[PDB]
Amino acid sequence: ERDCRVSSFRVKENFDKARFAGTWYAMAKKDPEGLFLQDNIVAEFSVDENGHMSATAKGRVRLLNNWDVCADMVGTFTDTEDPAKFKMKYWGVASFLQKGNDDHWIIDTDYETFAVQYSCRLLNLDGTCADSYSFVFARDPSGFSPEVQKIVRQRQEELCLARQYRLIPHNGYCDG
Ligand SMILES: CC1=C(/C=C/C(C)=C/C=C/C(C)=C/C(=O)O)C(C)(C)CCC1
Numbered sequence: 001e002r003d004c005r006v007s008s009f010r011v012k013e014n015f016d017k018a019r020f021a022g023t024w025y026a027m028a029k030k031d032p033e034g035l036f037l038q039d040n041i042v043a044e045f046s047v048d049e050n051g052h053m054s055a056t057a058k059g060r061v062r063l064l065n066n067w068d069v070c071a072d073m074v075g076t077f078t079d080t081e082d083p084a085k086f087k088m089k090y091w092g093v094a095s096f097l098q099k100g101n102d103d104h105w106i107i108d109t110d111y112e113t114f115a116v117q118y119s120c121r122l123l124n125l126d127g128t129c130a131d132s133y134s135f136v137f138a139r140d141p142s143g144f145s146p147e148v149q150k151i152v153r154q155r156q157e158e159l160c161l162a163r164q165y166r167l168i169p170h171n172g173y174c175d176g
Pocket of ligand 1: 035036037043055056057061071073074075089090091092096097098117135
């Protein structure tokens with residue numbers, strides 16, 4: 001019954017960028033295909049005088065050859081017609097880091113405790129997502145109340161991504 005068209009997905013009513021600024025800890029994630037951040041992920045959002053939003057993020061990345069590395073990444077966001085939908089150009093501090101362009105949607109947030117993000121990097125012909133990713137972020141590393149977990153579990157259902165998210169460890173590897 002429930003529609004999986006990325007076009008139909010709901011997003012944050014009247015997104016407020018400055019209000020999202022600060023440190024966010026990823027608690028759980030739904031990885032995309034290929035190399036992705038492993039764990040110990042922490043994002044840090046900024047918004048300039050102009051309204052230009054930017055972010056930095058640390059995360060452990062396992063390189064093909066098995067070395068583990070603490071990837072220091074960079075992201076710049078571009079506004080769209082949808083205040084909660086942005087275009088994100090990212091790159092790493094080190095040259096060997098994945099560089100790219102991806103959609104960045106703020107599905108839901110309360111700005112103070114949690115946030116569900118999402119990106120489809122490929123649309124199937126039908127209109128659903130063939131390559132997605134999603135971050136569940138928390139204001140406090142400790143996580144959230146069974147109350148908010150309810151909400152999140154709900155946003156996840158709506159993104160056609162329930163029962164396929166994983167918990168993210170934080171063990172200070174990239175120093176925390
Ligand atoms: C920029 C950006 C994001 C994507 C980061 C990616 C995609 C990092 C990939 C790192 C790799 C791919 C490192 C490596 O493999 O060296 C996320 C949504 C958290 C949202 C805001 C900041």
